[PDB]
From a paper:
Mammalian NAD-IDH functions as a heterotetramer consisting of two α subunits (37 kDa), one β subunit (39 kDa), and one γ subunit (39 kDa). Previous biochemical studies have shown that the enzymatic activity of mammalian NAD-IDH could be positively regulated by citrate (CIT) and ADP; and in the α2βγ heterotetramer, the α subunit exerts the catalytic role, and the β and γ subunits play the regulatory roles. In this work, we examined the inhibition of the αβ and αγ heterodimers and the α2βγ heterotetramer of human NAD-IDH by NADH and found that all these enzymes can be substantially inhibited by NADH.
To understand the inhibitory mechanism of the αγ heterodimer by NADH, we solved the crystal structure of the αγ heterodimer bound with an Mg2+ and an NADH at the active site and an NADH at the allosteric site (αMg+NADHγNADH) at 2.4 Å resolution using the molecular replacement method. The structure belongs to space group P3121 containing one αγ heterodimer per asymmetric unit. In the αMg+NADHγNADH structure, the NAD+-binding site is bound with an NADH: the adenine moiety of the NADH is located at the deep pocket of the active site and the nicotinamide moiety positioned in close to the ICT-binding site. Surprisingly, in the αMg+NADHγNADH structure, there is an NADH bound at the allosteric site, which occupies a large portion of the allosteric site. Compared with the αMgγMg+CIT+ADP structure, the ADP moiety and nicotinamide-ribose moiety of NADH occupy fully the ADP-binding site and the nicotinamide moiety of NADH occupies the Mg2+-binding site and part of the CIT-binding site, making extensive hydrophilic and hydrophobic interactions with the surrounding residues. Particularly, in the αMg+NADHγNADH structure, the hydrogen-bonding interactions between the side chains of Arg97G and Tyr135G and between the side chains of Asn78G and Arg272G at the allosteric site are retained, and thus all the side chains of these residues are oriented outwards from the CIT-binding site. In addition, the N-terminal regions of the α7A and α7G helices at the heterodimer interface assume loop conformation instead of helical conformation, and make no hydrogen-bonding interactions with the β7A and β7G strands of the clasp β-sheet.
Author numbering:
A (entry chain B): 15 to 347
B (entry chain A): 4 to 78, 81 to 337
């Protein structure tokens, strides 16, 4: 039996965590959840305790922490502190079309590997002259190489064929150029994977017209998480897509996007798919592949039935009813 | 009759400029073209500038229509020079679905308004130590205030009901915080326009699901024009999207957001829709609404019939034929 840190989070996080525990009990999953909370306080003690719990357990499942963008600049983002302190350098998101969820595009299968410790997370802002705010960001060879290293290894091990570096080296000649060159260095050691590059501007335009062309994407921690959110939107939105954060020793699992769903919280309507699929990726990281396959298959089979769909994807079902169908598919196995 | 400065530009530029001149002539538009072929020189010392001839023209005429221009081979672009000379502080990019040209997004009517002097443009990159690169970007109170004022002014003058400020204030607390602060101040004056704030990543998430919710989007330049490009992708791409840059001293330069297209720069192939619709924006900015509506309708009707479309839109026809058919319909 493994012990895993659980951060319930804000909004729909706590209610979705209960449903995960419920699914886990019914599937006889040898995992016990050790809960730590991250409140809205200006004091950093809560997030530091959370980091401490992750160092001990090495693995976490989390809901999403509310960001208040009206608090003083001294109050840094709690999720990003978690990401930098634990050195979770590889953010991995899998946007894949679900047959039963009909959107404007079919046959999307994109793995996005985003650098998750540098770039925007290294940002320093100062107002040393009144009315002038200057920002200073870092891109490095060491962090660019290990993200590229991660994306290619993932590509080869998943039976993928193409890695596309998404960048703005046409404008940021030194920084994004350095990132691009680090991807090229790694590409030389992976002759079975096709390496390509695309300007971020052109990537977003291609995504809304022909997203089928993309396989694996690798990118620095820049351009405001546009690509991840576009791709999440294309396949049906934040209710569906799971995210993972990997370091050399630690791993943290979550929904692809940061939305807490505050306005729909405690109304039994949140889509549980993303969170359930996040817990499956967690199970795979723990080498509990059999349990991951059972739950994942149940989730996807359930999503094939539109009566189980929640309002975010045009359905009329409740969360608890979708959880009921998931548990039913598990018990049949 | 009114004089506007025409910069024909490079590659497909001269072809599409000639096309626009022809449509305007056929529509009996009160426009005369002052051609200015602008190439970078060195004036006082080694400092790069636009020719006096071209500067005198634009300062006088105030209105400019511009084809695409090249990036220099060796390291100071013409677009940068025009931007700094006339202080083009507001980039306006309307995105409207075209009835004839079907994409998976049919309900799009979005105007992006982007700060055009800072962010990406104020940047310096440099090497800290080997394999460590730092970028430095700037946002100011004055420029944020100016773009916010412009966005609400545009919303009034173009019968728009909603202005959404787009930010990443979770990461960029100080700079986007300053942007939102200044947007909020302007919103207090203009209560006739509904104001809201949205995370950039949430805008992108929703845009792709339902672009109909969005009206006017205002943003700083920290991420360049990526959001505008997303919106462009919804309606058919760079071949159809118009753009305007509004500056100091009444100066406004209108242009296509697409490049020179050197691969198809060979005679009679390029889509002139994008430049034409920028010229339509120019007419509206000049108060020539009747000529704007007619030229606009003639272009849309030509696309709707779809029997003489350019190669980029799926047709087999060439530029001059497409141009000729718009000239045909605008006479009525
Ligand atoms: N990058 C970041 O850090 C972001 C943080 N947030 C946080 O979230 C709060 C706002 O909440 P939002 O969720 O943006 O809007 P909201 O509070 O109105 O909640 C409804 C939204 O939740 C989303 N959602 C997420 N997961 C869902 C699920 N499983 N089922 C159904 N709908 C789901 C839907 O897109 C829907 O529009 C903000 O106060 C902020 O703290 C929001 C967006 C980005
Ligand atoms: N505002 C401006 O003056 C801009 C200038 N450029 C310049 O253009 C040059 C090349 O840049 P890229 O982005 O690679 O070029 P681009 O933006 O033209 O690339 C888009 C692609 O779509 C096609 N395309 C573009 N416009 C078209 C039209 N009107 N009709 C039919 N097909 C069209 C082209 O074949 C090209 O492969 C650079 O030197 C750059 O400085 C680029 C963007 C804006
Ligand atoms: Mg662009």
């Amino acid at each position: 039996r493994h012990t895993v840190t659980m951060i319930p989070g804000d909004g729909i996080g706590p209610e979705l965590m209960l449903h995960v525990k419920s699914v886990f009990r019914h599937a006889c999953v040898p995992v016990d959840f050790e809960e730590v909370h991250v409140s809205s306080n200006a004091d950093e003690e809560d997030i530091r305790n959370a980091i401490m719990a992750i160092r001990r357990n090495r693995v976490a499942l989390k809901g999403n922490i509310e960001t208040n963008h009206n608090l003083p600049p001294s109050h840094k983002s709690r999720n990003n502190i978690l990401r930098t302190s634990l050195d979770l350098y590889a953010n991995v998101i899998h946007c894949k079309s679900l047959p039963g969820v009909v959107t404007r595009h079919k046959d999307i299968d994109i793995l996005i590997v985003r650098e998750n410790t540098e770039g925007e997370y290294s940002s320093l802002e100062h107002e040393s002259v009144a009315g002038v705010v200057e920002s200073l960001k870092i891109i490095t060879k060491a962090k660019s190489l290990r993200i590229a290293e991660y994306a290619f290894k993932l590509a080869q091990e998943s039976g993928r064929k193409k890695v596309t570096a998404v960048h703005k080296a046409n404008i940021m000649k030194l920084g994004d150029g350095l990132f691009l060159q680090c991807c090229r260095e790694v590409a030389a050691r992976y002759p079975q994977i096709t390496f390509e590059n695309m300007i971020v501007d052109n990537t977003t335009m291609q995504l809304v017209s022909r997203p089928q062309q993309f396989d694996v994407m690798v990118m620095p921690n820049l351009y405001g998480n546009i690509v991840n959110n576009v791709c999440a939107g294309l396949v049906g939105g934040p209710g569906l897509v799971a995210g993972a954060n990997y370091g050399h020793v630690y791993a943290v699992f979550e929904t692809a996007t940061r939305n807490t769903g505050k306005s729909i919280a405690n109304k039994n309507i949140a889509n549980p798919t993303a969170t359930l699929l996040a817990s499956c990726m967690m199970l795979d990281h723990l080498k509990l592949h059999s349990y991951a396959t059972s739950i994942r298959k149940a989730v996807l089979a359930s999503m094939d039935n539109e009566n189980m769909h929640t309002p975010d994807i045009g359905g009329q079902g409740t969360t608890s009813e979708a959880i009921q169908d998931v548990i039913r598919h598990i018990r049949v196995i | 009759v009114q004089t506007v400065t025409l910069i024909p530009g490079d590659g497909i530029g001269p072809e599409i400029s000639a096309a626009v001149m022809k449509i305007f002539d056929a529509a009996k538009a009160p426009i005369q073209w002052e051609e200015r072929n602008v190439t970078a020189i060195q004036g006082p010392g080694g400092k790069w500038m636009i020719p006096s001839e071209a500067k005198e023209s634009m300062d006088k005429n105030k209105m400019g229509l511009k084809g695409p221009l090249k990036t220099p081979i060796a390291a100071p672009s013409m677009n940068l020079l025009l931007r700094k000379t006339f202080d083009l502080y507001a980039n306006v990019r309307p995105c409207v679905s075209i009835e004839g040209y079907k994409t998976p997004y049919t309900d799009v009517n979005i105007v992006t308004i982007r700060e055009n002097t800072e962010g990406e443009y104020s940047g310096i990159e440099h090497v800290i130590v080997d394999g460590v690169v730092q970028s430095i970007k700037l946002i100011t109170e004055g420029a944020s205030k100016r773009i916010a004022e412009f966005a609400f002014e545009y919303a009034r003058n173009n019968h728009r009901s909603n202005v959404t400020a787009v930010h990443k204030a979770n990461i960029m607390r100080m700079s986007d915080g300053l942007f939102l602060q200044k947007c909020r101040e302007v919103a207090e004056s203009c209560k006739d326009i509904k104001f809201n704030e949205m995370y950039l990543d949430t805008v992108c998430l929703n845009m792709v699901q339902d672009p109909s919710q969005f009206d006017v989007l205002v943003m700083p330049n920290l991420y360049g024009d990526i959001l505008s490009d997303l919106c462009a992708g919804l309606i058919g791409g760079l071949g159809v999207t118009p753009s305007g840059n509004i500056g100091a001293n009444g100066v406004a330069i209108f242009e296509s957001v697409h490049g020179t297209a050197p691969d198809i720069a060979g005679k009679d192939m390029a889509n002139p829709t994008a430049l034409l619709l920028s010229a339509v924006m120019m007419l509206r900015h000049m108060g020539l609404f009747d000529h704007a509506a007619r030229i606009e309708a003639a272009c849309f009707a030509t696309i709707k019939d779809g029997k003489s479309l350019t190669k980029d839109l799926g047709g087999n026809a060439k530029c001059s034929d497409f141009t000729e058919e718009i000239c045909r319909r605008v006479k009525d």
